[PDB]
Design an enzyme around this catalytic site. Structure first.
Site, short mmCIF file in Angstrom:
data_model
loop_
_atom_site.label_atom_id
_atom_site.label_comp_id
_atom_site.label_asym_id
_atom_site.label_seq_id
_atom_site.Cartn_x
_atom_site.Cartn_y
_atom_site.Cartn_z
N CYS A 157 -49.13 -67.79 24.61
CA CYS A 157 -50.48 -67.39 25.01
C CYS A 157 -51.38 -67.32 23.78
O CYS A 157 -51.12 -66.53 22.87
CB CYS A 157 -50.48 -66.04 25.73
SG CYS A 157 -51.98 -65.06 25.55
N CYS B 244 -56.92 -49.17 28.40
CA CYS B 244 -57.34 -47.90 28.97
C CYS B 244 -56.22 -47.42 29.88
O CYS B 244 -55.13 -48.02 29.89
CB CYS B 244 -58.66 -48.03 29.73
SG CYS B 244 -58.67 -49.19 31.12
N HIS C 201 -61.08 -55.72 36.67
CA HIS C 201 -61.07 -54.92 35.48
C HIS C 201 -61.23 -55.79 34.27
O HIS C 201 -62.07 -55.53 33.43
CB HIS C 201 -59.76 -54.17 35.39
CG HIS C 201 -59.72 -53.15 34.28
ND1 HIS C 201 -60.31 -51.94 34.38
CD2 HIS C 201 -59.11 -53.19 33.03
CE1 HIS C 201 -60.10 -51.25 33.26
NE2 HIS C 201 -59.37 -52.01 32.43
N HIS D 238 -60.74 -56.38 29.49
CA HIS D 238 -59.34 -56.02 29.29
C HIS D 238 -58.41 -57.02 29.94
O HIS D 238 -58.08 -56.89 31.11
CB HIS D 238 -59.14 -54.64 29.87
CG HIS D 238 -59.78 -53.56 29.04
ND1 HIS D 238 -59.48 -52.26 29.18
CD2 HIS D 238 -60.72 -53.64 28.00
CE1 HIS D 238 -60.19 -51.54 28.29
NE2 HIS D 238 -60.95 -52.38 27.58
N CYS E 231 8.91 -74.20 22.33
CA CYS E 231 10.24 -74.82 22.27
C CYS E 231 10.40 -75.69 21.03
O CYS E 231 11.50 -75.92 20.59
CB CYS E 231 10.56 -75.61 23.54
SG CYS E 231 9.54 -77.08 23.79
N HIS F 139 17.97 -62.34 -0.07
CA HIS F 139 16.55 -62.17 0.04
C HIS F 139 16.27 -60.73 0.21
O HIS F 139 15.36 -60.20 -0.42
CB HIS F 139 15.96 -62.98 1.17
CG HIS F 139 14.50 -62.71 1.40
ND1 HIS F 139 14.05 -62.19 2.54
CD2 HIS F 139 13.38 -62.88 0.58
CE1 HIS F 139 12.72 -62.04 2.48
NE2 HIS F 139 12.30 -62.45 1.28
N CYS G 275 16.50 -71.94 -5.59
CA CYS G 275 16.50 -71.28 -4.27
C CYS G 275 17.42 -71.91 -3.23
O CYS G 275 17.93 -73.02 -3.38
CB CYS G 275 15.08 -71.19 -3.72
SG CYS G 275 14.45 -72.61 -2.84
N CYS H 248 19.55 -109.61 -15.93
CA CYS H 248 20.46 -108.66 -16.59
C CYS H 248 20.67 -107.36 -15.80
O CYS H 248 21.24 -106.42 -16.32
CB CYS H 248 19.95 -108.36 -18.01
SG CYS H 248 18.67 -107.10 -18.20
N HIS I 153 9.13 -81.40 25.68
CA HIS I 153 10.21 -80.43 25.53
C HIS I 153 11.27 -80.86 24.52
O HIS I 153 12.02 -81.82 24.73
CB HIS I 153 10.85 -80.10 26.87
CG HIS I 153 11.60 -78.79 26.85
ND1 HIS I 153 11.15 -77.71 26.17
CD2 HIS I 153 12.79 -78.41 27.46
CE1 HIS I 153 12.01 -76.69 26.33
NE2 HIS I 153 13.02 -77.12 27.12
ZN LIG Z 1 11.13 -60.49 2.86
ZN LIG Z 2 16.92 -108.60 -18.02
ZN LIG Z 3 12.82 -73.51 -4.18
ZN LIG Z 4 -53.22 -65.52 27.13
ZN LIG Z 5 -58.58 -51.22 30.68
#
Ligand SMILES: [Zn+2]
Ligand SMILES: [Zn+2]
Ligand SMILES: [Zn+2]
Ligand SMILES: [Zn+2]
Ligand SMILES: [Zn+2]
Ligand SMILES: [Zn+2]
Ligand SMILES: [Zn+2]
Ligand SMILES: [Zn+2]
Ligand SMILES: [Zn+2]
Ligand SMILES: [Zn+2]
Ligand SMILES: [Zn+2]
Ligand SMILES: [Zn+2]
Ligand SMILES: [Zn+2]
Ligand SMILES: [Zn+2]
Lengths: 77, 434, 87, 41, 447, 90, 92, 43
Positions: free
Chosen positions: B5, B64, B78, B84, B143, B167, B250, B269, B390
């Site tokens: 507006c 008003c 009004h 207004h 699975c 561990h 490990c 060779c 599966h």
């Molecule tokens: Zn652990």
């Molecule tokens: Zn060779």
């Molecule tokens: Zn390792």
């Molecule tokens: Zn307007």
């Molecule tokens: Zn008014």
């Protein structure tokens, strides 16, 4: 054209209601208060027409959390 | 592009005018929300000129105290009489421009007016929700992990490792919530010893998986193979994590690691004139147009003559066009083998590949090599398809007896029948070396 | 000569609320509210516009057409039975 | 001729018109803010 | 029963004798593992008497250093000449008794001879493996279908009250725990965060999934996937987590009045009345809270039918029963509603669980309304109290093998259908055709 | 096939096949054993160095017999024999 | 004159040839499936005779065990052993 | 007594090797099974 005379036993700015409002608690347009206190718990949460319009939220740029308007101020600081 | 507006925008150039309107909008809206039914009818929904109740909408002047009905065109007057042009509908809290003849619907500032005196930060620091997430729309087997765990659990080197409490004795974390190898130790506790057979170790194991990585895929991809790589890498990681600060001492690096050697060689060779060694944990072999396993390994161990590598051999003083050959430098103690049946992320080779209960490996090692024989001790196969996948596991245990693991139904099964399976992963433990 | 005096004396008697809510309850449960809401969504498309004044005068007559006889009569009857009381 | 008939009718129309105008208000405004905010829905 | 070598047992009656035997066993065995082939052959696999290598098993005498072959009974002869009845097989360290003519296979101390020195302590504080665990054999309950969980949460995060509690950051602010890993509610917030705000939007669910399986050991989930049981479970978590972040150790919570999201929006109260048909007296009036209602559907076509049945005056049979006047005539019982919840959650009872593993699905479609009016079920003209349907969960299949789908009416009036990871739109006409299992109703109008 | 007169004379002397006591025979290896690395019955030590990793873990005939372990009375863990005495020393 | 069987075995060991003979034999029997078939048979006999007594169980197992060895493995290992005996044993 | 041939001594060495291996395997099965029956009377 009908009998009104005894009934009258009982007999402008919109801004006038502001103090009366602060005296008053949360109202609902079609959840009657009497019925709420009778049939529902006194501390029951209520949202009127909760699917009336999209969820009113905003999102934090700095964390991304979704934020309910009344929550955005407490979040920031 | 869709515009607001114009009338309300003009009044907003005055930052002090704005403030006044937002304050008035908030005030109405509060009065609306905190007025008893009778009060509301007679004070917000009673036109000042016609005196009727609910003569259609009833707008509360934003300038008003006048309330004007819609039905008898009374707020309009009004607005025409004394200028207004804004008024608020008392049913909803909505704000209507009478010169536009439409509601001012699209200004976040009015809509969100109870954040009036923090709006600058509210546009700086928080945004309007994306078109995509505005209504929170989004949807949400194992699975392929159990199958592999069953093989690990029936693997004499790992069983020994875990029962040896190595561990347990060093894990600083000491807890299967956080620690993955702690999860494994609990599976081994529930299965071989006393509770005080259940799924606690498994559940815990899964849940570490999903958090740990990354999450990703992390229910995916239904690839037993990559899960095996995942398990064993975790194991090695937690070994590193446990120390007080390119090879490794490990459980994983002393039972499953061997080495491929990729020589360039002199035809004349027969000397390596260039040699690159590259560790492995499993071997991945193609089964296309092939009938048995040896033919897969054969093709893996083949010599290629390179057309791009003309060179001087020093050792025999001549020009050569060199010959490249992949071959095993070091064998692991358990040799894990994948047959490539999968195009990488819905196609699947289904050829039966014949695999022995005893596999001789002398022909695939470098430098003649004696007999080196492994005992088959574990199969994983995949029935169904991509999507429909599966995995089933089959394991040999002490006594020669085989057992089949079909998603928590465990049943004895003959050797003769395991040997018929469409193998995807094969697990071989070193048995004889001459 | 005024009719808002009748109205004023209904709000006061608390019978305006009874009527107003009985009406909503019936429309709501008839699916009226919803059919209206859709009717508006529709016309905003088949007129490609969202101007309240415009949408309203193609919607509002049909809206009123949509209110079923059952509810008209029962509410109207409740209003009469409340008119006697008052006047 | 303000009979009970024409009055009752008056009042009902008022309630019904107020409510059609409420809902229409509630829904046009809604779709406007939508089209503005997300010009590509 | 199996036996033991009485001969070995005889010598183990003396503890010094016992210890020499084990010392030698360990020594023989140690040598077998620590000798080069040529040395093992010539010195542990060569008969003292015939000098043949590998004349069958060669035994290493346990009381001297003689080696006796089997195929010519040269050890048996050693044992007869000199009295040495025990021998160890140089191919496997296994102890043999030449009078029993068998091996000693079943004495644990001898099999575990490297622990001789701590034996008393070992058999005291440890035990042999149980028959059923000895080979590590056991299933791994695979986690196939969690669609009984996805479905419930799509109701929960399309529930305008919960969204509001979540986006209000009310929990986040006060959670001492503060981690998706351990706290259930944090999970739900993360689900809210991922869904509504801004890799896969699966992470919250995964955190939620995992807390589930830990705090509920081992199941939930994978024995019985009652979408309904999972409802009860979640809303109960939320209440525990709320009560954790209290200031006091105060019993207003859990009842007679909690103030958490669940109890302020989901809890109502039933009123059981035990009444006489003789005297009108009410002997008992219990008022029990509820978080959902369960309705019987057999031979019923309509939701209100199912509610009426729930509301009917029950006849009650207690034989030795005490009433004022009419102690005779059976006691009329009625359930009715004494307080309604902001959200009425209803379960249609479809999974009949019968004797032993037996069960039955009730597939018969029940007619349920877009607006439900509860005046008739409340306690003692009551005003129209209208709820609006906002969510459904329906279940295809069988009690053990079957699938859940969610449906939610989102803000606007537009219905969506959630199948694991496939959100889609759907016509209200068409959602009212569904086989309702869990209905979710939001308070809309009360007169 | 062919009848045998005896072992070649030069072989007899070269390998001293004419020649221990020996009721001391087996107990006499204990010394060399103590400075001899672990040995497997059919894992040729030399082939193992060549084709396997020096750090390699090995278990001979892994499925020969059932896992030798015992369970802890207090914690319920299954312990390999070589681990029991430390577990029990807390 | 004459216990040459043992002396011949001493030489085979010291020269490293017994190891080769013995190791080839297992390689074959293992791969051939024999050692496992002998395990099954031993279990089968423990069952049939409701006994775990070595002397008695070997008594029915050994002779079957011996027959099972392939004409292939049996031939090849003997050739090997003969080829070795000829380097050291003079004939007639 | 009787003829000791290349064939006969050879078969002697083979039988020795073969009888040792059988007696190893049977020893390992008989004991292992004795243990399981003493340890678990039910089965
Ligand atoms: Zn652990
Ligand atoms: Zn060779
Ligand atoms: Zn390792
Ligand atoms: Zn307007
Ligand atoms: Zn008014
Ligand atoms: Zn933030
Ligand atoms: Zn007017
Ligand atoms: Zn002796
Ligand atoms: Zn002998
Ligand atoms: Zn004995
Ligand atoms: Zn939390
Ligand atoms: Zn609570
Ligand atoms: Zn009575
Ligand atoms: Zn313990």
């Amino acid at each position: 054209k009908g009998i009104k005379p005894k009934v009258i036993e009982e007999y402008d700015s919109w801004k006038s209601l502001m103090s009366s409002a602060k005296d008053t608690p949360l109202q609902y347009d079609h959840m009657n208060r009497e019925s709420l206190k009778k049939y529902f718990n006194p501390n029951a949460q209520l949202i009127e027409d909760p699917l009336d319009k999209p969820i009113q939220y905003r999102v934090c740029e700095k964390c991304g959390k979704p934020l309910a308007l009344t929550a955005i101020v407490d979040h920031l600081e | 592009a869709m515009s607001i507006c114009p009338h309300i925008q003009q009044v907003f150039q005055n930052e002090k005018s704005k403030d006044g309107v937002l304050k008035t909008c908030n005030a109405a809206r509060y009065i609306l929300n905190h007025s008893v039914p009778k009060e509301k009818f007679l004070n917000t929904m009673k036109c000042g000129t016609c005196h009727e109740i609910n003569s259609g909408a009833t707008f509360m002047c934003l300038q008003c105290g006048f309330c004007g009905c819609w039905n008898h065109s009374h707020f309009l007057s009004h607005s025409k009489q004394i200028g207004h042009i804004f008024g608020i509908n008392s049913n909803n809290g909505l704000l209507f421009c009478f010169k536009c003849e439409d509601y001012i619907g699209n200004i976040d500032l009015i809509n969100d007016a109870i954040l009036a005196k923090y709006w600058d930060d509210v546009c700086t620091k928080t945004m309007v929700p994306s078109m995509e997430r505005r209504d929170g729309l989004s949807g949400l087997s194992t699975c392929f992990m159990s199958s592999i765990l069953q093989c690990l659990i029936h693997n004499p080197y790992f069983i020994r490792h875990s029962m040896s409490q190595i561990h347990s004795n060093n894990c600083k974390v000491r807890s299967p919530d956080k620690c993955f190898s702690c999860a494994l130790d609990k599976i081994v506790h529930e299965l071989y010893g006393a509770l005080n057979n259940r799924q606690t170790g498994f559940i815990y194991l899964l849940t570490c998986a999903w958090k740990i990585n990354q999450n990703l895929a992390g229910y995916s991809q239904q690839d037993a193979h990559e899960f095996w790589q995942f398990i064993i890498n975790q194991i090695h990681q937690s070994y590193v994590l446990d120390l007080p600060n390119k090879q490794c001492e490990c459980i994983v690096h002393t039972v499953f690691e061997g080495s491929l050697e990729s020589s360039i060689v002199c035809p004349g060779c027969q000397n390596n004139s260039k040699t690159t060694i590259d560790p492995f944990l499993d071997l991945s072999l193609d089964i296309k147009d092939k009938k048995k396993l040896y033919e897969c390994l054969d093709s893996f161990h083949k010599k290629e003559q390179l057309k791009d590598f003309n060179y001087h051999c020093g050792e025999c003083n001549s020009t050569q066009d060199a010959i490249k050959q992949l071959g095993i430098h070091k064998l692991p103690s358990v040799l894990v083998l994948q047959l490539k049946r999968f195009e990488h992320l819905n196609r699947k080779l289904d050829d039966f590949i014949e695999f022995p209960t005893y596999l001789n490996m002398k022909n695939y090692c470098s430098t003649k090599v004696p007999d080196i024989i492994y005992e088959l001790i574990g199969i994983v196969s995949h029935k169904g398809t991509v999507n429909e996948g599966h995995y089933i596991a089959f394991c040999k245990i002490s006594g020669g007896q085989w057992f089949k693991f079909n998603d928590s139904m465990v049943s004895s099964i003959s050797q003769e029948e395991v040997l018929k399976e469409q193998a995807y992963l094969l697990f071989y433990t070193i048995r004889q070396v001459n | 000569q005024l009719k808002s005096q009748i109205q004023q004396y209904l709000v006061e008697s608390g019978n305006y609320e009874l009527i107003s809510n009985e009406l909503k309850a019936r429309l709501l449960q008839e699916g009226w509210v919803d059919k209206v809401k859709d009717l508006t969504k529709s016309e905003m498309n088949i007129n490609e516009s969202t101007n309240f004044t415009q949408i309203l005068s193609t919607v509002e007559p049909k809206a009123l057409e949509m209110v079923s006889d059952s509810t008209r009569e029962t509410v109207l009857k409740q209003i009469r039975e409340f008119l006697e009381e008052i006047v | 001729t303000i009979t009970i008939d024409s009055i009752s009718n008056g009042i009902l129309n008022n309630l019904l018109t107020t409510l059609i105008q409420d809902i229409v208000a509630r829904e046009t405004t809604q779709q406007q803010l939508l089209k503005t905010r997300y010009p590509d829905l």
